[PDB]
């Protein structure tokens, strides 16, 4: 997990994960539904945004070139990071 | 076997120490003191950013230290004369003692030029002398003024170099007599040439530069994350000194 200082406590991290999603180890996106829109910036340009749609039960998918891979996972609760796991401070 | 810590430093002991393998960007200083031995350089000195200078080193006049050169005056005092040329990646060193019995300090006279890749250690270099590349003068040897040393020449310890002559070889030997014009101007010619180059480099000195911005940005990010740490070096040093005094006094009786 990235440093949670200057992060709002309700931003639901997984976005603040310390990992670069690869093909053999994607970043698992939690979702309350079978599909969800996420936004990924260009690794070579912070100003460029590509919005994509991940679907439940799919292979790893890359949105921008030379970007992270992603896999959606349907969950019933998303850890609202800032008082869920840093109050745990495990 | 000496601890890397100094409680009796002229400035106090360092509280937090950082591992070199933990360094993510180089922090190499060109000039820095050695305990209570401090540098002495002219206001218009040319020091290449990749040069190495430390401690009790004397430099006079329009002398120059060029890229990657080393002047490590840790074991003795080092003196550099007026308008003396030190080219790239040369070393001026010294020892604690010499068989000759004189001062082990390495002396360089004024208007003395040094080609790249030279090792100077505990030698007296009279003014107006040329030093060749891949050439070394050992401890206790003396080079008289108005002399030219060929490159790839070895000067053994405690040897003498008579003036007005050209010498060279491994070991060094007589070659030919320097002409009167060579004594008159040529040495000073090389001195002025390399001093002009050094001042040319000094003209475009953008010091201290702007590369600190990125490091400042990273520190500012740590501040936003709050992980950047505050430490009073003064009071922590006072506590460390008191701890040293207490622990030392608690072990005599």
């Amino acid at each position: 997990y990235r440093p949670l200082g200057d992060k709002e406590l309700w931003h639901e991290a997984w976005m603040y994960e310390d990992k670069f999603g690869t093909e053999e180890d994607p970043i698992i996106v939690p979702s309350l539904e079978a599909e969800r829109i996420i936004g990924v910036t260009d690794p070579e340009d912070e100003t460029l945004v590509v919005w994509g749609i991940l679907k439940d039960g799919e292979p790893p998918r890359q949105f921008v070139e030379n970007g992270e891979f992603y896999v959606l996972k349907h969950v019933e609760y998303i850890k609202k990071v800032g008082d869920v796991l840093e109050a745990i401070e495990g | 076997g000496v601890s890397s810590q100094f409680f009796d430093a002229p400035n106090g002991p360092s509280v937090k120490q950082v591992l070199i393998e933990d360094e993510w960007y180089n922090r190499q200083r060109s000039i820095f003191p050695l305990l209570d031995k401090e540098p002495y350089y002219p206001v218009d000195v040319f020091v290449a950013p990749n040069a190495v200078v430390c401690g009790d080193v004397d430099i006079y006049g329009g002398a120059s230290v060029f890229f990657g050169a080393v002047l490590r005056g840790d074991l003795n005092k080092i003196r550099l004369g007026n308008r003396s040329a030190i080219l790239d990646r040369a070393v001026v060193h010294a020892a604690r003692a010499v068989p000759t019995g004189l001062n082990a300090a390495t002396l360089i006279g004024e208007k003395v030029t040094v080609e790249p890749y030279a090792v100077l250690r505990s030698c007296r270099v009279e003014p107006k002398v040329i030093i060749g590349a891949r050439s070394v003068v050992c401890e206790g040897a003396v080079v008289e003024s108005e002399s030219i040393l060929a490159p790839n020449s070895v000067v053994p310890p405690a040897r003498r170099i008579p003036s007005g002559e050209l010498w060279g070889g491994s070991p060094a030997k007589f070659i030919r007599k320097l002409t009167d014009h060579e004594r008159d101007r040529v040495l000073d010619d090389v001195s002025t040439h390399y001093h002009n180059l050094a001042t040319m480099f000094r003209r475009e000195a953008l010091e201290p530069g702007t590369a600190w911005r990125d490091v400042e940005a990273w520190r500012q990010k740590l501040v936003d994350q709050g992980e950047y740490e505050w430490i009073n070096f003064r009071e922590q040093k006072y506590l460390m000194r008191l701890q040293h005094e207490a622990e030392a006094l608690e072990k005599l009786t």
Partner: protein, 62 residues
């Protein structure tokens, strides 16, 4: 900070002085670097900040 810089883990080259270490995840995900070999340096040893030490190097204690 190139005093401690990696080199390429090659198949034929026997690593006996340095030590293989995993590459940072960015290097692997970007330009296919899985194993890198960094010097095995004793903590008591000292290296200047301007040297060029890379890869399969062992430094003795002190």
């Amino acid at each position: 900070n190139l005093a401690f810089a990696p080199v390429h883990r090659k198949p034929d080259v026997p690593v006996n002085a340095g030590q293989v270490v995993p590459a940072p995840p960015a290097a692997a995900r970007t330009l296919k670097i899985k194993e890198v070999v960094v010097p095995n340096k004793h903590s008591t040893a000292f290296v200047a900040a301007n040297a060029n030490v890379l890869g399969n190097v062992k430094l003795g204690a002190g």
